[PDB]
Protein backbone atom coordinates (compact mmCIF):
# COMPACT_ATOMS: atom_id res chain seq x y z
CA UNK A 1 0.00 0.00 0.00
CA UNK A 2 0.86 3.73 -0.09
CA UNK A 3 -0.92 4.80 3.11
CA UNK A 4 2.45 5.37 4.82
CA UNK A 5 2.76 8.94 3.55
CA UNK A 6 -0.50 10.15 5.10
CA UNK A 7 0.51 8.50 8.39
CA UNK A 8 3.84 10.33 8.35
CA UNK A 9 1.97 13.53 7.46
CA UNK A 10 -0.18 13.32 10.59
CA UNK A 11 2.91 12.31 12.58
CA UNK A 12 4.80 15.42 11.47
CA UNK A 13 1.77 17.74 11.78
CA UNK A 14 2.18 17.72 15.59
CA UNK A 15 4.65 20.62 15.56
CA UNK A 16 2.84 22.53 18.33
CA UNK A 17 2.87 28.28 5.75
CA UNK A 18 4.13 24.67 5.90
CA UNK A 19 1.30 23.19 7.97
CA UNK A 20 -1.19 24.43 5.37
CA UNK A 21 0.81 22.64 2.68
CA UNK A 22 0.87 19.43 4.70
CA UNK A 23 -2.88 19.53 5.36
CA UNK A 24 -3.44 20.14 1.63
CA UNK A 25 -1.23 17.11 0.99
CA UNK A 26 -3.37 14.98 3.32
CA UNK A 27 -6.59 16.17 1.69
CA UNK A 28 -5.13 15.38 -1.72
CA UNK A 29 -3.94 11.88 -0.70
CA UNK A 30 -7.30 10.93 0.72
CA UNK A 31 -7.46 9.24 -2.72
CA UNK A 32 -7.19 5.43 -2.92
CA UNK A 33 -5.84 2.84 -5.38
CA UNK A 34 -2.11 3.62 -5.22
CA UNK A 35 -0.49 6.99 -5.84
CA UNK A 36 -1.47 6.70 -9.53
CA UNK A 37 -1.12 9.73 -11.85
CA UNK A 38 -0.11 12.26 -9.18
CA UNK A 39 2.89 14.15 -10.66
CA UNK A 40 5.21 12.81 -7.97
CA UNK A 41 7.26 16.01 -7.38
CA UNK A 42 4.27 17.19 -5.32
CA UNK A 43 3.65 13.99 -3.31
CA UNK A 44 6.64 14.87 -1.09
CA UNK A 45 7.59 18.51 -1.88
CA UNK A 46 6.56 19.94 1.56
CA UNK A 47 9.03 17.53 3.18
CA UNK A 48 11.81 19.13 1.12
CA UNK A 49 10.53 22.57 2.09
CA UNK A 50 11.12 21.69 5.76
CA UNK A 51 14.75 20.66 5.33
CA UNK A 52 15.63 23.21 2.63
CA UNK A 53 14.89 26.31 4.71
CA UNK A 54 16.93 27.57 7.69
CA UNK A 55 14.26 28.87 10.08
CA UNK A 56 12.98 25.71 11.83
CA UNK A 57 14.33 23.89 14.88
CA UNK A 58 16.19 20.61 14.60
CA UNK A 59 13.42 18.37 15.94
CA UNK A 60 11.09 19.00 13.01
CA UNK A 61 13.95 18.54 10.53
CA UNK A 62 14.82 15.21 12.13
CA UNK A 63 11.18 14.13 11.88
CA UNK A 64 11.03 15.13 8.21
CA UNK A 65 14.27 13.29 7.43
CA UNK A 66 12.98 10.21 9.25
CA UNK A 67 9.86 10.41 7.08
CA UNK A 68 12.01 10.66 3.94
CA UNK A 69 14.10 7.67 4.99
CA UNK A 70 10.93 5.70 5.73
CA UNK A 71 9.57 6.50 2.26
CA UNK A 72 12.78 5.44 0.55
CA UNK A 73 13.35 2.29 2.62
CA UNK A 74 9.80 1.09 2.01
CA UNK A 75 10.29 2.16 -1.65
CA UNK A 76 7.18 4.31 -2.01
CA UNK A 77 8.73 5.95 -5.07
CA UNK A 78 9.49 3.37 -7.78
CA UNK A 79 9.87 3.15 -11.55
CA UNK A 80 6.09 2.97 -12.04
CA UNK A 81 5.63 6.34 -10.30
CA UNK A 82 5.21 9.30 -12.64
CA UNK A 83 8.20 11.67 -12.71
CA UNK A 84 10.16 9.64 -10.15
CA UNK A 85 13.42 10.86 -11.70
CA UNK A 86 12.62 14.47 -10.88
CA UNK A 87 11.60 13.66 -7.31
CA UNK A 88 14.75 11.66 -6.58
CA UNK A 89 16.73 14.50 -8.18
CA UNK A 90 15.09 17.10 -5.94
CA UNK A 91 15.48 15.11 -2.71
CA UNK A 92 19.26 14.94 -3.08
CA UNK A 93 19.32 18.54 -4.33
CA UNK A 94 17.61 19.96 -1.24
CA UNK A 95 19.82 18.19 1.31
CA UNK A 96 22.97 19.86 -0.05
CA UNK A 97 21.75 23.33 0.96
CA UNK A 98 21.37 24.61 4.54
CA UNK A 99 19.75 22.63 7.34
CA UNK A 100 19.60 22.35 11.19
CA UNK A 101 22.31 18.51 17.26
CA UNK A 102 24.76 16.35 15.33
CA UNK A 103 22.30 13.47 14.88
CA UNK A 104 20.42 15.48 12.24
CA UNK A 105 23.55 15.68 10.09
CA UNK A 106 24.19 11.95 10.53
CA UNK A 107 20.62 11.28 9.42
CA UNK A 108 21.24 13.39 6.31
CA UNK A 109 24.49 11.51 5.68
CA UNK A 110 22.87 8.09 6.09
CA UNK A 111 20.04 9.03 3.74
CA UNK A 112 22.60 10.29 1.21
CA UNK A 113 24.43 6.95 1.48
CA UNK A 114 21.24 5.00 0.96
CA UNK A 115 20.08 7.12 -2.00
CA UNK A 116 23.41 7.17 -3.83
CA UNK A 117 24.20 3.47 -3.33
CA UNK A 118 20.81 2.32 -4.68
CA UNK A 119 19.81 2.00 -8.36
CA UNK A 120 17.91 5.31 -8.32
CA UNK A 121 21.10 7.21 -7.47
CA UNK A 122 22.35 6.30 -10.94
CA UNK A 123 19.62 8.57 -12.37
CA UNK A 124 20.95 11.72 -10.65
CA UNK A 125 22.42 14.43 -12.85
CA UNK A 126 26.20 14.73 -13.01
CA UNK A 127 25.98 18.37 -11.87
CA UNK A 128 24.48 17.23 -8.52
CA UNK A 129 26.83 14.46 -7.36
CA UNK A 130 29.61 17.06 -7.24
CA UNK A 131 27.51 19.04 -4.77
CA UNK A 132 26.91 15.93 -2.64
CA UNK A 133 30.64 15.16 -2.62
CA UNK A 134 31.42 18.77 -1.68
CA UNK A 135 28.96 18.60 1.22
CA UNK A 136 30.30 15.31 2.59
CA UNK A 137 33.88 16.54 2.15
CA UNK A 138 33.02 19.70 4.09
CA UNK A 139 31.65 17.50 6.87
CA UNK A 140 34.70 15.22 6.88
CA UNK A 141 37.39 17.91 6.74
CA UNK A 142 35.83 20.06 9.46
CA UNK A 143 36.87 19.16 13.02
CA UNK A 144 34.38 21.25 15.03
CA UNK A 145 31.85 18.40 14.85
CA UNK A 146 31.97 15.24 16.92
CA UNK A 147 34.55 12.65 15.94
CA UNK A 148 32.14 9.75 15.41
CA UNK A 149 30.16 11.80 12.89
CA UNK A 150 33.45 12.54 11.14
CA UNK A 151 34.16 8.80 10.96
CA UNK A 152 30.70 8.23 9.48
CA UNK A 153 31.53 10.94 6.94
CA UNK A 154 34.78 9.13 6.17
CA UNK A 155 33.00 5.83 5.51
CA UNK A 156 30.25 7.31 3.33
CA UNK A 157 32.75 9.19 1.18
CA UNK A 158 34.74 5.98 0.66
CA UNK A 159 31.53 4.18 -0.32
CA UNK A 160 30.34 6.82 -2.79
CA UNK A 161 33.85 7.03 -4.27
CA UNK A 162 33.74 3.29 -4.96
CA UNK A 163 30.26 3.67 -6.42
CA UNK A 164 31.31 6.58 -8.67
CA UNK A 165 34.51 5.04 -10.01
CA UNK A 166 32.69 1.76 -10.63
CA UNK A 167 30.60 3.65 -13.21
CA UNK A 168 33.83 4.33 -15.15
CA UNK A 169 33.58 1.01 -16.99
Amino acid sequence: PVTIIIKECINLSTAMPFLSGFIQLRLMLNKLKNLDNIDSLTILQPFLLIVSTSSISGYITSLALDSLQKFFTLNIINESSQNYIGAHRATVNALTHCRFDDSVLLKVVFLLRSIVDSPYGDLLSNSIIYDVLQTILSLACNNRRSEVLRNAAQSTMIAVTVKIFSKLK
Copy 2:
Protein backbone atom coordinates in the same frame (compact mmCIF):
# COMPACT_ATOMS: atom_id res chain seq x y z
CA SER B 1 34.50 5.26 16.66
CA VAL B 2 35.66 1.63 16.86
CA LEU B 3 32.08 0.59 17.57
CA LEU B 4 30.85 2.74 14.68
CA LYS B 5 33.28 0.86 12.43
CA VAL B 6 31.93 -2.41 13.87
CA VAL B 7 28.32 -1.45 13.13
CA PHE B 8 29.15 -0.15 9.65
CA LEU B 9 31.00 -3.33 8.70
CA LEU B 10 28.12 -5.41 10.10
CA ARG B 11 25.68 -3.52 7.87
CA SER B 12 28.01 -3.80 4.88
CA ILE B 13 28.45 -7.55 5.29
CA VAL B 14 24.78 -8.32 5.93
CA ASP B 15 23.35 -6.14 3.14
CA SER B 16 25.74 -7.41 0.44
CA PRO B 17 25.02 -10.61 -1.54
CA TYR B 18 27.43 -12.46 0.82
CA GLY B 19 24.90 -12.29 3.66
CA ASP B 20 22.44 -14.96 2.57
CA LEU B 21 25.23 -17.52 3.01
CA LEU B 22 25.44 -16.75 6.74
CA SER B 23 24.05 -19.54 8.89
CA ASN B 24 20.72 -18.57 10.43
CA SER B 25 22.03 -19.22 13.97
CA ILE B 26 24.47 -16.28 13.55
CA ILE B 27 22.19 -13.46 12.41
CA TYR B 28 20.34 -13.76 15.72
CA ASP B 29 23.66 -13.02 17.42
CA VAL B 30 24.19 -9.97 15.20
CA LEU B 31 20.71 -8.66 15.96
CA GLN B 32 21.24 -9.27 19.68
CA THR B 33 24.54 -7.37 19.64
CA ILE B 34 23.19 -4.36 17.74
CA LEU B 35 20.21 -4.33 20.15
CA SER B 36 22.54 -4.42 23.17
CA LEU B 37 24.39 -1.48 21.62
CA ALA B 38 21.22 0.46 20.80
CA CYS B 39 19.33 0.13 24.10
CA ASN B 40 22.35 0.99 26.26
CA ASN B 41 22.17 4.71 27.02
CA ARG B 42 25.72 5.03 28.40
CA ARG B 43 27.13 5.28 24.87
CA SER B 44 27.03 8.40 22.72
CA GLU B 45 23.60 9.42 21.46
CA VAL B 46 24.73 9.78 17.84
CA LEU B 47 26.19 6.27 17.97
CA ARG B 48 22.82 5.05 19.26
CA ASN B 49 21.10 6.73 16.30
CA ALA B 50 23.56 5.03 13.95
CA ALA B 51 22.81 1.67 15.56
CA GLN B 52 19.06 2.21 15.24
CA SER B 53 19.37 3.07 11.54
CA THR B 54 21.60 0.02 11.02
CA MET B 55 19.08 -2.24 12.73
CA ILE B 56 16.23 -0.95 10.58
CA ALA B 57 18.45 -1.49 7.53
CA VAL B 58 19.06 -5.15 8.47
CA THR B 59 15.50 -5.83 9.69
CA VAL B 60 14.17 -4.79 6.28
CA LYS B 61 16.60 -7.24 4.66
CA ILE B 62 15.64 -10.03 7.07
CA PHE B 63 11.89 -9.70 6.61
CA SER B 64 12.17 -9.23 2.85
CA LYS B 65 13.82 -12.68 2.80
CA LEU B 66 10.45 -14.03 4.04
CA LYS B 67 9.20 -14.46 0.48
